[PDB]
Every structure is written in structure tokens, then in C-alpha cells.
Amino acid sequence: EPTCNTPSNRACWSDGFDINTDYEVSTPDTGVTQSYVFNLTEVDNWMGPDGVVKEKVMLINGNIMGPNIVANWGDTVEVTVINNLVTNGTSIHWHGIHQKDTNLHDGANGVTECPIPPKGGQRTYRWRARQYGTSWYHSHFSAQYGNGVVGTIQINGPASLPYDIDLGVFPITDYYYRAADDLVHFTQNNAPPFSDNVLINGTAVNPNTGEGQYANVTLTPGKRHRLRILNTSTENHFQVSLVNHTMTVIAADMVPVNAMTVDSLFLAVGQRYDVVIDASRAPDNYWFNVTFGGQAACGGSLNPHPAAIFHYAGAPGGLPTDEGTPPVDHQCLDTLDVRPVVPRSVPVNSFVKRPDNTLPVALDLTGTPLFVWKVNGSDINVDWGKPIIDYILTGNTSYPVSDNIVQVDAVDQWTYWLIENDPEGPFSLPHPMHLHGHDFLVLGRSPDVPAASQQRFVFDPAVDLARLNGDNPPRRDTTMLPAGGWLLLAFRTDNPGAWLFHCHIAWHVSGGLSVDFLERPADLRQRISQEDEDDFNRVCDEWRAYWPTNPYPKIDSGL
């Protein structure tokens, strides 16, 4: 609970806790628990917000998204998940929540848990809110979250700029009328489709019939508003802009940053930005536009102009009349100019590229299906019925090859990872790379060029070491791997666990594009509670008894 957080002093939170506190190591002891119950149901012939009826959706508590989780910094969040789907298992992953020494609550089926079985299976997740900001949750059962198993997280805390009004969450997502498993099957042998629409806070107008509604945000004239923008898509990467207004970034993913004013923002799949908008212009209706850059390399929509309305209170109703001007083309790249308020410093001069720190991503066209994504030679394929944690608990280290285990034994040390984007393959695409368990430092990447330009880079210390930044670089949980290029990340091994590191485009992680960092496994078994072990085994027993009765095969990685 805050005691000094006010509009003119958002930096303050409570005694001992403010925007400069190192939240990764110091957490308020609030003693409070915020609990939720998620009931997952399978609904056929569901009428969506743009008027089109979808063949099948998978909903939390009967709505297009699950409830907005809300707690304070230092609370515990507890979610009972009850799976009333017909056939699918489910696992809910709390994206952006590092699960420090709570790996078994990460929701990564086949890694940290077996899936909760359908027809009434249940599990309760419990995690500490050791960060504040905007995050989200979604299924990790193959591409299930593309059917509706998704929602937002708002953990309140201090901020890097004063503001008057917290407008809350503003999730933006691609929207397909086809169901997720159908799209996974499709994308195994075909380029992915443009989205049928882009929803903004759950709604959009159908570009074809005019049904639906624009999201409508009311601004209080003369006031400073925090807007928590998310990209919860399965594939689309968005540019956002508000006509005639700038946006001031105060957080990137769940990491507060020094204020940074921009005219438009690029959000990768899974990224968030907290921004402050000053209602400083003439009272009117303004469009908030979603646009695409990068010559389609990171998505498009068949709605040519997805948008929301920002309405100044007291102004007329109606649609905005100024179409504004297109934002700069971000070329499928997030900005590396953000700077965390709580800094990190690491050396970059000593980096040496070696097989054991290099993750080559490659598209393999030579087998079945046609599009298979491999990392270091292997497409990931997890066993929902024998998760990596089961190996840890039984002392078996014979991990299957397709689990893509990258064992990291270093204890609370910075580890450096060079990811290479198929520079030798016939073509390469942008990928939004996401790490569970940690925020990474973005130490650098290949030179920024047009996403569709086919220019290729391989890391060369002679020119690239000097392009690296270890002086408080961007710190976040998702960033872009440039098409044709490379990306150098670092993270500190402060959290024993099995942690996925994967592309967040559903079609690609389905297709194999992940590894699993097995961090300090010799420390992990000691740190697993009896309750967590017992409940892991309970759910896996139920899952393993269920699975042979399932009528459908698993057709992808499981993730």
C-alpha cells in the first residue's frame, strides 16, 4: 500500500520504497494477497466486437480477455485457474513477472508444469509482485492464447514522472476470425496472414460492414494522463501515434525509464510502454492510429486503418476529422534509446563470440512441415507430460535433445548471448525475442536498416564491439532480433529455474523457435517447496491420465 504517491510526487511510494529503489532486490512487505479465479470455457459461434461471428473461442470468465489483475508492489497475486475447455490443457504464464525463486508458477507447460487438464482441472498460481508496471498473462499451451486466453496485469508503484490520471491498460491486439490451431496448421506450410482486424482495448470497427465501435478514451483537458499500452498479439507488430500529441515514455515493459518524449512508438509482440499524454491541445476528438512499418515484415492488417478515439471531455461527440500524418517507419525495430531509472552497468569490451554463447536461428525448409524454426540446429518440442522440472525433481539429467536445454551454471553472474538471425539463409525475418525469468540488457544489435532490404550482418568484433552499450542500456523482457542480423543480450543469473527464451510470434514458437535456459539447476531442486513439488506432481498425474483420452494430436512444439 502506498503512503506518499501523489499526482505531483509519483516518485514516492512508501517508507523505504520509491522510484530509485532497486526493485529487483528490495520488495515492500505488504502482507496483502489479491486473488482471482479464472474459469476457462470453450465457446462456439461467438459474436466478436467487430460483428463477425468466430467459429470457436476460449474465454476467461466469459469475456474477450481475462480480468485486469491489479495489486500493489509487494503484494502477492494468487490466481486459481479452472480449465473447463473441452479438450485442451492450459497453462497461464505471467509475462513480465520474473517469478524469483518461484519457477514452478511460471506457467510454461512442458517446462515448469504439466498442463491443467480440461473438463474441470485446476491449479492455483501464486507469485510475489516484486516489480511494478504493466505486464500481461496468456496461455502457453501451443497457440491457445490466440483464442482468448489472455489478459493484463497492472502492479501499482512509483513512476518517473508526475501525472494526474492513470487511464489504465490499453491492450492492442491482432484479431483473426480463424482459430489458433487452424492458423498454426496453416502457417506450418504457408506465410502467415494479415490480421482480420486490430482490436484496441477490446474493440474495433469492421472495415467491411462498419459494425463495431472505436475504443473511446476521454482525456481531461489540462491534465497529464498515464496510458499503459500493450501489444498482446500473436503476430502483429504495431506502430502507435496520437494525432497532434506527443507521448512521453516512463516505462518499457515492466521497467521504469527516464522520461522520453516521442511522436510515435513501435511495440513488438509482447512489449509494453507506459506513456504520459498531456491534454494540452485544443479540445476535440483525436485519432490514435495503429500503423505498420517494415514493409510488412512484422505484420499487417486487412483493416487498413485500425484506430481509437481520444475525446477531450466537454468537446463535441463524433469522429475525429484530422487524418494526421503517417509516423516514421520504425522498420520492425524497437527503440534502444530508453534508459532505466535504476541503472545497470556491464562490460562489453571483453565479449568473445563462442559456440557456447551463440544462438543461431535458422528456418529449415527441408523437412515436413515446410516452415520449421531451429535454434542451434534444433526446433524446440517439449513434453507436456514430462516437464523439465520433473527431471530436476527426480535427478535425471538426460534431457531430450528437443528440449533445447542451454544449461547455465554461473552463479549470479552476467551471461552474454549472441542471437544470429539466419544470416546465411535465403531470407530472414524480424523476431520479437522474449526471456522468461528476467529482464535482459540489450547490449546492441546489427545496424538498423529497412526490414525488407535483405541486408545481412554477422557479428564482427572489429566494428561491432564499439557499437555495444553496457552503460545502463535498455533493460526489458522483449526486444527485436533484426532481420538478417544479430542481437546481443545479457542477463544476470539471479534466479534458478528453467526459463524459456523464444520468439513471441505464436506461429514461430509453435514452429520451434525457442531455447530453454536451465539456470543453476544444482540450486533449483533445493529451492522448490514441498507444496510446489506435491502440486506439480498432482497436476502431472492428472494430465498424464487425461492425455491418452484426448482426441487430437499435438501438432507443434507445445509452446
Ligand X SMILES: *[C@@H]1O[C@H](CO)[C@@H](O[C@@H]2O[C@H](CO)[C@@H](O)[C@H](O)[C@H]2NC(C)=O)[C@H](O)[C@H]1NC(C)=O
Ligand Y SMILES: *[C@@H]1O[C@H](CO)[C@@H](O[C@@H]2O[C@H](CO)[C@@H](O[C@@H]3O[C@H](CO)[C@@H](O)[C@H](O[C@H]4O[C@H](CO)[C@@H](O)[C@H](O)[C@@H]4O[C@H]4O[C@H](CO)[C@@H](O)[C@H](O)[C@@H]4O)[C@@H]3O)[C@H](O)[C@H]2NC(C)=O)[C@H](O)[C@H]1NC(C)=O
Ligand Z SMILES: *[C@@H]1O[C@H](CO)[C@@H](O[C@@H]2O[C@H](CO)[C@@H](O[C@@H]3O[C@H](CO)[C@@H](O)[C@H](O)[C@@H]3O)[C@H](O)[C@H]2NC(C)=O)[C@H](O)[C@H]1NC(C)=O
User: Is 503 one of the annotated binding-site residues?
Assistant: yes
By CB under 6 A, what part of segment 256-315 binds ligand NAG? 281-282, 284
Tell whether residue 14 is a contact of ligand Y (CB under 6 A): no
Tell the smallest beta-carbon distance from residue 96 to Cl ion (Å): 5
182-202 exposure pattern, b = at least 16 Cβ within 10 A, e = fewer:
ebbbebbeeebbbbbbbbbbb
Q: What is the sign, positive or negative, of the torsion defined by CA atoms of 471, 154, 137, 169?
A: negative
C-beta of 81 vs 183, nearer to its own copies = 183
User: What whole-number distance in Å separates Cα of residue 538 and Cα of residue 536?
Assistant: 5
User: Is 504 one of the annotated binding-site residues?
Assistant: yes
Q: Which grid coordinates belong to 262?
A: 516521442
User: What whole-number distance in Å separates Cα of residue 261 and Cα of residue 263?
Assistant: 7
C-beta of 10 vs 436, nearer to Cl ion = 436
Span near ligand Z by CB under 6 A; candidates 46-54, 63-71, 324-332, 399-407: 324-332
| Binds 20: which of ligand Z, its own copies, ligand X, none (CB < 5-8 Å by kind) | none
Tell whether residue 100 is a contact of Cu ion (CB under 5 A): no
Tell the smallest beta-carbon distance from residue 313 to ligand Y (Å): 12
Tell whether residue 544 is a contact of ligand Z (CB under 6 A): no
User: Is 105 one of the annotated binding-site residues?
Assistant: no
159: Cβ contacts below 8 Å, ≥ 6 apart = 10, 11, 19, 226, 250, 251, 256, 274
From the CB of residue 547, how many other CB atoms can be counted at a distance below 10 Å?
A: 15
Tell whether residue 450 is a contact of its own copies (CB under 8 A): yes
By CB under 6 A, what part of segment 180-239 binds ligand Y? 201, 217, 227
Span near ligand NAG by CB under 6 A; candidates 108-116, 190-198, 312-320, 393-401: 393-401
Residue closest to 216 by CA, chosen among 135, 319, 64: 319
Question: Looking up cell 502506498, which residue turns up?
Answer: 2
Q: Which of 47, 86, 296, 319 binds ligand X (CB under 6 A)?
A: 319
By CB under 8 A, what part of segment 128-167 binds its own copies? none
Tell whether residue 296 is a contact of its own copies (CB under 8 A): yes
C-beta of 166 vs 329, nearer to ligand Z = 329
375-410 exposure pattern, b = at least 16 Cβ within 10 A, e = fewer:
beebbbbbbbbbbbbbbbbeeeeebeeebbbbebee
Q: Pairing state of beta strands 358-364 and 238-242? A: unpaired
C-beta of 196 vs 379, nearer to ligand NAG = 379
By CB under 6 A, what part of segment 173-232 binds ligand X? 216, 218
| Binds 16: which of ligand NAG, Cu ion, ligand X, none (CB < 5-8 Å by kind) | none
| Binds 450: which of ligand Z, ligand NAG, its own copies, none (CB < 5-8 Å by kind) | its own copies
C-beta of 282 vs 552, nearer to ligand Z = 552
Tell whether residue 343 is a contact of ligand Z (CB under 6 A): no
Tell whether residue 105 is a contact of Cl ion (CB under 5 A): no
From the CB of residue 216, how many other CB atoms can be counted at a distance below 10 Å?
A: 14
Q: Pairing state of beta strands 414-421 and 358-364? A: parallel
Task: Report angle CA 192, 198, 202 to the nearest 5 degrees.
Answer: 130
Which run of H or of E encompasses 53?
strand 53-60
C-beta of 18 vs 78, nearer to Cl ion = 78
Q: Which of 10, 54, 95, 237 binds Cl ion (CB under 5 A)?
A: 95
By CB under 6 A, what part of segment 135-174 binds ligand Y? 165-170
Tell whether residue 300 is a contact of its own copies (CB under 8 A): yes
Q: With contacts defined by CB under 8 A, how many residues of the chain interact with its own copies?
A: 23
User: What whole-number distance in Å separates Cα of residue 490 and Cα of residue 293?
Assistant: 28
In the sheet that holds 414-421, the strands lie side by side as 372-375, 358-364, 414-421, 486-492, 440-445, 475-476
User: Is 95 one of the annotated binding-site residues?
Assistant: yes
Ramachandran category for residue 356: left, alpha or beta (phi over 0 → left; psi -120 to 50 → alpha): alpha
By CB under 5 A, what part of segment 418-447 binds Cu ion? 431, 436
Tell whether residue 7 is a contact of ligand Y (CB under 6 A): yes
Q: Which residue is nearest to ligand X (CB)?
A: 317
Tell the smallest beta-carbon distance from residue 291 to its own copies (Å): 12
Residue closest to 434 by CA, chosen among 261, 231, 295, 168: 231
Residues 523 and 411: beta-carbon distance below 8 Å: yes
Tell the smallest beta-carbon distance from residue 213 to ligand X (Å): 7
Residue closest to 69 by CA, chosen among 173, 155, 140, 138: 155
C-beta of 430 vs 474, nearer to its own copies = 430
Residues 340 and 470: beta-carbon distance below 8 Å: no
**Residues that constitute the known binding site for Cu cation:** 93, 95, 138, 140, 431, 434, 436, 502-504, 508
Binding site for ligand NAG (CB under 6 A): 39, 41, 62, 82, 84, 244, 281-282, 284, 322, 386, 394, 396, 398, 400
